[PDB]
Design a protein around this ligand. Sequence first.
Ligand SMILES: *[C@@H]1O[C@H](CO[C@@H]2O[C@@H](C)[C@@H](O)[C@@H](O)[C@@H]2O)[C@@H](O[C@@H]2O[C@H](CO)[C@@H](O[C@@H]3O[C@H](CO)[C@@H](O)[C@H](O[C@H]4O[C@H](CO)[C@@H](O)[C@H](O)[C@@H]4O)[C@@H]3O)[C@H](O)[C@H]2NC(C)=O)[C@H](O)[C@H]1NC(C)=O
Ligand SMILES: CCCC[C@H](N[C@@H](CCc1ccccc1)C(=O)O)C(=O)N[C@@H](Cc1ccc(O)cc1)C(=O)O
Ligand SMILES: *[C@@H]1O[C@H](CO)[C@@H](O)[C@H](O)[C@H]1NC(C)=O
Ligand SMILES: [Cl-]
Ligand SMILES: [Cl-]
Ligand SMILES: [Zn+2]
Length: 578
Amino acid sequence: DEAEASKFVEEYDRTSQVVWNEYAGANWNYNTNITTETSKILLQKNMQIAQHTLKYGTQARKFDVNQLQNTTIKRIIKKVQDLERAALPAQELEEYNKILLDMETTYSVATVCHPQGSCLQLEPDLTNVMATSRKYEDLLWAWEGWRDKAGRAILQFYPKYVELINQAARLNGYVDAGDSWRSMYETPSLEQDLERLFQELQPLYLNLHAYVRRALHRHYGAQHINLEGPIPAHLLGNMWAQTWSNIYDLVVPFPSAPSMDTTEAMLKQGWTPRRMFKEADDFFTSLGLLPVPPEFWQKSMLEKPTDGREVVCHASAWDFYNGKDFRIKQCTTVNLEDLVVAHHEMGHIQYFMQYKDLPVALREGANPGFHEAIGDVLALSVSTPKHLHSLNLLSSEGGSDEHDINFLMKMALDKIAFIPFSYLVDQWRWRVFDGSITKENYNQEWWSLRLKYQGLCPPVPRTQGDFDPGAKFHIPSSVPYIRYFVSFIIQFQFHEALCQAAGHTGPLHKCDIYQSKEAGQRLATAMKLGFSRPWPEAMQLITGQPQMSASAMLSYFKPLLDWLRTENELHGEKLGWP
Ligand SMILES: *[C@@H]1O[C@H](CO[C@@H]2O[C@@H](C)[C@@H](O)[C@@H](O)[C@@H]2O)[C@@H](O[C@@H]2O[C@H](CO)[C@@H](O[C@@H]3O[C@H](CO)[C@@H](O)[C@H](O[C@H]4O[C@H](CO)[C@@H](O)[C@H](O)[C@@H]4O)[C@@H]3O)[C@H](O)[C@H]2NC(C)=O)[C@H](O)[C@H]1NC(C)=O
Ligand SMILES: CCCC[C@H](N[C@@H](CCc1ccccc1)C(=O)O)C(=O)N[C@@H](Cc1ccc(O)cc1)C(=O)O
Ligand SMILES: *[C@@H]1O[C@H](CO)[C@@H](O)[C@H](O)[C@H]1NC(C)=O
Ligand SMILES: [Cl-]
Ligand SMILES: [Cl-]
Ligand SMILES: [Zn+2]
């Protein structure tokens, strides 16, 4: 009895490696070369992997998991009983796979065109406009044009997508697809836990919001900024206003302490996409973690092709499920933002290598937020003045109190501003999936949450037919988002624990873990667990306790909260908005 179950998981592991490796290859070939032919092969391989999933999932459901004694085999079999989309009848499976392909292709080939003029892609053209333009109407053209072209074009697919992903979820024992996504955390209290964490970050976010609102009022005019209202969503340096660091120049706390232009420094010094990934590789190995294999450098796509191919530029990391072939696909631009992205993606690669000897069913992060956090932890140290100076991208190490608050502001514009955005995306989607939001009010309810959580308003009133969520990659690509909220909380918990392991003393935000083998050992032991144990065990291995907690992020930013409160008080800001 226990014997049949052990044999079954062995057979599942062997066959899954082969099939998933074949699917990954077809998916890579489409993502890096969008054509009719690669689309057809991918859709065919979708059917092949579904046949495998159905065969083994059907067997798996004949085991009474309650009677199995070994907890690891119990855990694997329970997971294989979830067929995901392979539970759908053949006709609906074919339709679902085609919808997903059509949505991701539509997002990735959308362009915004001037009349009798040039046509702009999202990466790099519109991203660069949002990051560097300081003209209200040019920012508005890019913001509205992207939503008109990408968002509106996804709307025709989204209702049927919702119907089919929910149908598959119900066929696998869940009430809807949002329920199935939340289950990946194995935490019944998840929704309340995340709400409590969000509430703890409100002092910092509200004070940052009010300070940036005041600075935007100074630049864009009192007629365009309401000092007691939400901020127009096209003014924050980013297409989705999800990170705000590109408007640092407008909000510098201490302008008498100027910062080096890091992009021109990287360009002046001949940085390339390959250099950026080599620096990330060096940071990981400095911690005693694993180098990427030679195969990684031969097969990765680290810059946008120039030979005519259309590609999915959105950065991503790829496991080919054979323990040797790992790749990154990124349309890298030479700037500091993409250097952080490179570290993020290399953290995914590191996790793939650390758990490569587990059975494939357990080759995931402890929870999805853990997978997202590894690269970001290292990038916190990369971003310090100490490390950037060592890369020749900043002129000094910043001893002065002024430089210190400036640095904390630059970090807050990315890390704190992202908290409400990352919370709200799946608050919206969870309610779409549970039927609380219908196609009658997709967009209205999106903007209700953008207001409630982020304090943003659309610069142009939305109209029927708008589908602004469709203009954000993870929506048409059906990638869950709450992982990134979890990641941004726990990455500071990890930073704090690794800095302690490294012997750092003094303020947390001055810590740089480069070359700490003690810090690397903590990470490696946790990553090697994969998905074999409840995630609180990996949390306790890294941090010495088992909970998610905002206290580390609050500690990191404590000097900035103090500065922001004083600054906002003396200007008389009214925190929040109606
Ligand atoms: C419940 O079942 C799991 C899984 O068992 C494994 O899968 C089954 C489907 C079946 O094929 C089994 O035959 C198979 O073992 C058990 O978890 C495994 O437990 C073993 C032994 O505890 C682990 O073996 C380890 O494998 C490592 C591979 O890198 C190896 O390095 C380890 O070496 C350690 O010990 C040696 C000798 O002292 C030392 O030199 C090393 O330095 C290191 O300390 C070790 O051989 C598997 O990794 C486990 N697999 C998983 C997925 O966890 C589990 O034990 C069982 N439960 C009970 C209560 O028996
Ligand atoms: C910095 C990384 C940017 C690129 C990253 N790319 C996805 C592809 C995920 C994927 C999964 C399955 C199939 C296809 C893709 C991934 O690697 O997680 C991403 O999207 N980050 C979020 C969220 C985010 C933002 C800023 C950060 O510092 C970290 C995270 C965002 O930019 O909104
Ligand atoms: C792109 O895909 C087509 C169709 O499969 C193929 O013939 C071509 O070789 C591919 N191009 C590259 C550069 O891989
Ligand atoms: Cl939007
Ligand atoms: Cl998730
Ligand atoms: Zn990621």
